[PDB]
C-alpha cells in the first residue's frame, strides 16, 4: 500500500513569487504520478499527470518534476487564483492513493479590516433569542484578535468565531464573531463592543451601539 | 464534461442511501467511472470504480458489502447505492472520471459532489433574520448588511443575494455546529453606503433537506 505524504502541509507565497510543494511516496511509483488543484467549495481539477506532463488548458506556471519517491509542483509567479489545496495521487498501483494535500495561502500586502457591529434584530427579539455579530472584513493576514465588552465587561468564553476562505480575487480573509448570550441578559446592558486587533491597525478599532438607540 | 451528483442527505446510522450521477457531453459507455470521496475539512480517497460494460468493480476495504456501484449506459448514469451507513462515511462523494487512453488510474473530470450525511439528529429548516446596523452612520462611505442563518440541520445551505445578481463582496461564512447540535452560519454584503435607499437587498436562503426557501428583506 503506498501512502503520500505531502509536507509541508501550508505555505505561504507573496503573488508573482515562488511556491514549491513537495509529495513523497513510501514506493517507488516510477512517474505515475498526478497533481490536482482543489479550490474552496470546488471539486479538484487536474493539473499535471505523468509527474511532469500538463493537462491540457493548465497556465505554464504550473510545473512538475521528480521520478520514483520524490516528487515537486512548483507554481511559478503565483496569482491570487491559485489560492487553493493541492493534491498528490499515485497510480502504480490501481486505482491509487492521494496524498494529505498542501494548502497554498498567498502572501498578499497587510489588510486591515472594516468592522461592523450588528445588533439583534427586533424579528429574533421576537423569537426569544439573542446574539451580536461582529463582522472584521476583507483583512490579511487571517491573525486577528476578537475582544467583546457588555457595558465595558470584558468577555470571555461565550463567542463563537467562523472566518472565511482566502478570497480568489484579493486574497484577504473575512471572520465573524458571534456573542452568545440569552435575549433576557441581552436586555439587561446597554452598551455592546467589538474591539478587534490586527497587525494593519496601529491601535485597536471598536465598534459599537447602545442596545436603546436601535 | 458534466458529471452531476444527486441523491446526498441525512441518512440514520444503519441507513441506507442511493447516490447518483449524471453524465453528460462525452461518450460516457467507454470510460470507467469512480466515486471518491472527501470527509469534512478531510482529504480525497476513492471509494469505487466500474468497468466501461459494467463487468469489473473494485471497493475500498471498509466499504465492501455495504456499498453496490452500478450503471445505466442508456442514460448515461453510475450510482452508488450505499448500506449500512456509519458516521465515518459522512463525506462529500464526487464521480469522477479515469482517463481512457496506456491506462493509468487518472480521475480527469468531477463532479461538484453531493454530501451525505450519517447521522441520527433529525432534519430542521432555518430561521433567517436580517443583520442591520444599530443605527445610521453619518460618516463611512460603505455599509455592511448580512443574514443570520440559525439553528438548521443537516448541511448544506445555500445563500445568495437579489437571487444571484449580487455576488461582488459578498461572504458566506462556514456553519458553525453548536453544542445543541445545530448549524448557525451568517451571510454578509458590503455595499455603497449611498445605496441603502435606492437599492433593495435581499438574502435567499435554501435549504434543501428541510425544503425550506426564505427570501429575507435587509433593512
Request: hydrophobic share 30%; with cysteine.
Amino acid at each position: 500500500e503506498i501512502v503520500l505524504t505531502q509536507s509541508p502541509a501550508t505555505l505561504s507565497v507573496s503573488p508573482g513569487e515562488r511556491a514549491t510543494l513537495s509529495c513523497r511516496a513510501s514506493r517507488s511509483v516510477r512517474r505515475e504520478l498526478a497533481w490536482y488543484q482543489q479550490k474552496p467549495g470546488q471539486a479538484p481539477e487536474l493539473l499535471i499527470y505523468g509527474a511532469s506532463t500538463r493537462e491540457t488548458g493548465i497556465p505554464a506556471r504550473f510545473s512538475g518534476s521528480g521520478s520514483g519517491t520524490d516528487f515537486t509542483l512548483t507554481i511559478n509567479s503565483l496569482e491570487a487564483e491559485d489560492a487553493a489545496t493541492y493534491y498528490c495521487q499515485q497510480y502504480r498501483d490501481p486505482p491509487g492513493t492521494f496524498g494529505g494535500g498542501t494548502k497554498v495561502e498567498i502572501k498578499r500586502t497587510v489588510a486591515a479590516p472594516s468592522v461592523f457591529i450588528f445588533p439583534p434584530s427586533d424579528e429574533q427579539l421576537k423569537s426569544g433569542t439573542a446574539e451580536v455579530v461582529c463582522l472584521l472584513n476583507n483583512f490579511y493576514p487571517r491573525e486577528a484578535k476578537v475582544q467583546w465588552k457588555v457595558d465595558n465587561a470584558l468577555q470571555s468564553g461565550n463567542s463563537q468565531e467562523s472566518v472565511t476562505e482566502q478570497d480568489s480575487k484579493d486574497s484577504t480573509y473575512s471572520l465573524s464573531s458571534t456573542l452568545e448570550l440569552s435575549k433576557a441578559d441581552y436586555e439587561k446592558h446597554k452598551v455592546y463592543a467589538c474591539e478587534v486587533t490586527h497587525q494593519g491597525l496601529s491601535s485597536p478599532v471598536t465598534k459599537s451601539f447602545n442596545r436603546g438607540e436601535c | 464534461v458534466q458529471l452531476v451528483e444527486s441523491g446526498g442527505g441525512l441518512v440514520q446510522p444503519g441507513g441506507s442511501l442511493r447516490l447518483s450521477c449524471a453524465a453528460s457531453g462525452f461518450t460516457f459507455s467507454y470510460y470507467d467511472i469512480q466515486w471518491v470521496r472527501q470527509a469534512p475539512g478531510k482529504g480525497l480517497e476513492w471509494v469505487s470504480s466500474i468497468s466501461p460494460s459494467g463487468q469489473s468493480t473494485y471497493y475500498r476495504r471498509e466499504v465492501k458489502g455495504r456499498f453496490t456501484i452500478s450503471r445505466d449506459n442508456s442514460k448515461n448514469t453510475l450510482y452508488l447505492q450505499m448500506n449500512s451507513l456509519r458516521a465515518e462515511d459522512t463525506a462529500v462523494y464526487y464521480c469522477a472520471r479515469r482517463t481512457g487512453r496506456e491506462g493509468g488510474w487518472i480521475f480527469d473530470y468531477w463532479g461538484q459532489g453531493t454530501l451525505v450525511t450519517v447521522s441520527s439528529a433529525s432534519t430542521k429548516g432555518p430561521s433567517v433574520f436580517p443583520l442591520a446596523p444599530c443605527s445610521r452612520s453619518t460618516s463611512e462611505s460603505t455599509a455592511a448588511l448580512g443574514c443570520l442563518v440559525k439553528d438548521y440541520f443537516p448541511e448544506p445551505v445555500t445563500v445568495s443575494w437579489n437571487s444571484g445578481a449580487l455576488t461582488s463582496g459578498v461572504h458566506t461564512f462556514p456553519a458553525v455546529l453548536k453544542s445543541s447540535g445545530l448549524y448557525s452560519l451568517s451571510s454578509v454584503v458590503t455595499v455603497p453606503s449611498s445605496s441603502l435607499g435606492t437599492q433593495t437587498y435581499t438574502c435567499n436562503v435554501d435549504h434543501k433537506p428541510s425544503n425550506t426557501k426564505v427570501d429575507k428583506r435587509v433593512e
